[PDB]
């Protein structure tokens, strides 16, 4: 059909782009010869590496955005599954190590606020002198 013909034309255009990047996709006599020479000069001037980089940067950016979205969704699903394991009480032994690590990190962050061991004795003595 027309869609099949368009798909074949797109496949041919993609093959042409893969073989020679920087070439456009397919959709007087002395002047035509000079135009052919100018087209050869333009093909020499254009860099296959430059066009390849200009396309691969956008392709890698789109792929990285899709992969980041998929990884964020997978992490959120894993967190929800771990939470609903914790609610059910059937968390695995391989599981809940993340829970213990999060608890330890939050405990360290909270206990960092409290005090220091060396200043504790001085604070106790000064507090005893203030309160007495």
């Amino acid at each position: 059909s027309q869609t099949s013909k368009y798909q074949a034309t797109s496949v041919v255009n993609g093959l042409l782009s893969n073989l020679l990047p920087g070439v456009p996709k397919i959709r007087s006599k002395a002047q035509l010869i000079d135009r052919n020479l100018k087209k050869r000069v333009q093909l020499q001037n254009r860099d296959v590496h430059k066009i390849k980089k200009k396309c691969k940067l956008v392709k890698k950016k789109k792929v990285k955005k899709h992969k980041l979205d998929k990884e964020q969704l997978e992490q959120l699903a894993k967190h929800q599954v771990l939470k609903k394991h914790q609610h059910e009480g059937t968390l695995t032994d391989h599981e809940r190590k993340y829970l213990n690590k999060l608890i330890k990190r939050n405990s360290q962050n909270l206990r960092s606020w409290d005090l220091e061991e060396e200043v504790r004795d001085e604070l106790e003595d000064i507090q005893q002198s203030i309160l007495k």
């Binding site: 013909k5 074949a8 496949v11 041919v12 993609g14 007087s28 006599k29 010869i33 052919n36 093909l43």
Partner: protein
């Protein structure tokens, strides 16, 4: 199974909404629902559900929609799913005889397999690639337009993936490629067929990139096909010829180009073909570097003489023929820059013989006066470029010139341009 059934129902609705209503908003809503369903399920689960769905869906449109969904899953680029993609490609190859019944289904399956092979590269095993190349040869034998174009693309991808493994099946497929190019030249029924010929040229370029030795062996056929493909892009043909110029040796490429020009380009009156041959010769001369022994001066001299004779006897305009002759003079330039006096002096003697006696002329219809005028222009350009020992060659060339001056004194040669050149 429930997800596969929902996806099959959505694909059937999208494929048969027009048939049931016989609509654009409904199709857009169905596409949005299909995209949501694809984003809901992982690619591996979607592939595992869609693997029985292709066999379950007897509708060719539903099978094509499932192939498009699998193509979207592959264009998501799951790296770990590539072995699962390999199993899906094996299942697609199994369903390909069933997909070969419908032209659109076969084209969609071939395009999806080619896209999957291009995305995978050499990451997976190439036995499936060789089987796909055999199926592509079968589709080329079937000779539908879109199916043959997709088969050529898949064969090029499989050859790029295999490399040395595809070099075994390469000589068995190249004369079929020449036959397909001849058939595309003979029949111009469709712009799809023109695009299929362009894809055949692209496959020839890919085979040249993959196997430089086989490309050098069949360079004459490739150059003939590139010259005959007038419907193809001239810039793309010039780029393919340049790539063949790096892959092939310069002297052998020049000899093959001279043979092809004598066989076809001199015979053909097409200005586009003449310009393509001149551009190929100029590219070969520009890429010709070092090579103190040129190893073929008479081949280039006979090519220049045949170019002058073809400009004289051509149906093209005189101004275009003069521009082509100026291009031929620019091509003959830098041969003087390649300076081997022990090689140049017999070459200069042969050039003087072709100028005056015209020994070994490619065409006898070329006038001796016109040949002398062209050789005088070339000799003046070479003397202006080099000098030095050119005056020593001018001493040898003066003795025929003195007879020519005597003929000029006797007014045997009435060419004012030739007299001014002398």
């Amino acid at each position: 199974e429930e997800f596969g059934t929902l996806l099959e129902g959505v694909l059937f609705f999208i494929n048969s909404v027009e048939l049931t209503f016989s609509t654009t908003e409904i199709k857009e809503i169905l596409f949005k629902v299909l995209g949501n369903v694809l984003q809901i399920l992982p690619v591996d689960e979607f592939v595992n559900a869609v693997l029985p769905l292709l066999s379950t869906s007897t509708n060719e449109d539903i099978r094509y929609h499932l192939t498009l969904v699998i193509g979207s899953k592959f264009e998501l680029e799951g790296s770990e799913a590539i072995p699962i993609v390999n199993n899906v490609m094996k299942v697609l190859l199994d369903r390909m005889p069933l997909e070969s019944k419908s032209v659109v289904i076969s084209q969609v399956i071939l395009n999806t397999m080619t896209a999957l092979v291009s995305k995978y590269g050499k990451k997976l095993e190439g036995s499936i690639l060789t089987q796909a190349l055999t199926l592509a040869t079968e589709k080329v034998s079937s000779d539908m337009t879109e199916v043959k174009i997709s088969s050529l693309a898949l064969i090029t991808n499989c050859v790029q993936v295999l490399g040395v493994k595809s070099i075994a099946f390469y000589p068995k497929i190249v004369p079929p490629s020449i036959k397909l190019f001849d058939a595309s030249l003979a029949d111009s029924s469709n712009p799809l067929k023109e695009q299929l010929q362009v894809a055949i040229l692209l496959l020839f370029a890919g085979l040249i990139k993959r196997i430089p030795s086989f490309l050098m062996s069949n360079i004459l056929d490739v150059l003939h096909v590139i010259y005959f493909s007038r419907e193809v892009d001239s810039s793309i043909r010039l780029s393919v010829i340049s790539l063949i110029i790096e892959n092939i040796d310069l002297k052998e490429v020049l000899k093959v180009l001279f043979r092809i020009w004598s066989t076809e380009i001199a015979t053909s009156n097409d200005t586009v073909a003449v310009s393509l041959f001149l551009s190929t010769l100029e590219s070969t001369v520009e890429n010709i570097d070092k090579k103190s022994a040129t190893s073929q001066s008479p081949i280039f001299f006979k090519l220049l003489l045949s170019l002058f004779e073809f400009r004289s006897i051509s149906s093209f305009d005189n101004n275009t023929i003069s521009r082509i002759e100026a291009s031929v003079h620019e091509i003959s330039n830098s041969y003087v820059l390649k300076m081997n006096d022990k090689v140049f002096r017999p070459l200069f003697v042969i050039l003087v013989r072709w100028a005056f006696d015209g020994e070994g002329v490619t065409n006898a219809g070329i006038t001796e006066t016109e040949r002398l005028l062209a050789f005088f222009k070339f000799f003046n350009k070479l003397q202006e470029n080099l000098r030095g020992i050119i005056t020593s060659y001018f001493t040898y060339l003066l003795e025929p010139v003195d007879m020519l001056l005597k003929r000029f004194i006797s007014k045997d040669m009435e060419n004012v341009n030739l007299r001014r050149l002398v």
